[PDB]
PDB file of C-alpha atoms in Angstrom:
ATOM      1  CA  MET K   1       0.204  -0.285  -0.271  1.00 22.27           C
ATOM      2  CA  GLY K   2       2.739   2.394   0.658  1.00 20.88           C
ATOM      3  CA  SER K   3       1.806   3.628   4.058  1.00 20.36           C
ATOM      4  CA  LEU K   4      -1.510   5.474   3.101  1.00 25.55           C
ATOM      5  CA  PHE K   5      -0.595   7.803   5.994  1.00 24.39           C
ATOM      6  CA  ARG K   6       2.145   9.260   4.062  1.00 25.15           C
ATOM      7  CA  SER K   7      -1.021  10.302   1.322  1.00 27.57           C
ATOM      8  CA  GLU K   8      -3.003  12.158   3.828  1.00 27.91           C
ATOM      9  CA  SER K   9       0.155  13.308   5.848  1.00 29.90           C
ATOM     10  CA  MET K  10       1.317  15.282   3.130  1.00 27.20           C
ATOM     11  CA  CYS K  11      -2.298  16.333   2.366  1.00 27.68           C
ATOM     12  CA  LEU K  12      -2.424  18.359   5.664  1.00 26.66           C
ATOM     13  CA  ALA K  13       1.433  18.851   6.436  1.00 25.65           C
ATOM     14  CA  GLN K  14       1.435  21.314   3.611  1.00 24.66           C
ATOM     15  CA  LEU K  15      -1.387  23.104   4.658  1.00 27.86           C
ATOM     16  CA  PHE K  16      -0.411  23.213   8.046  1.00 29.00           C
ATOM     17  CA  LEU K  17       3.028  25.198   7.586  1.00 33.08           C
TER      18      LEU K  17
END
């Protein structure tokens, strides 16, 4: 799967900075 968490993490982290 490739750690789906990475897909969501980069989705929020971006707008988090």
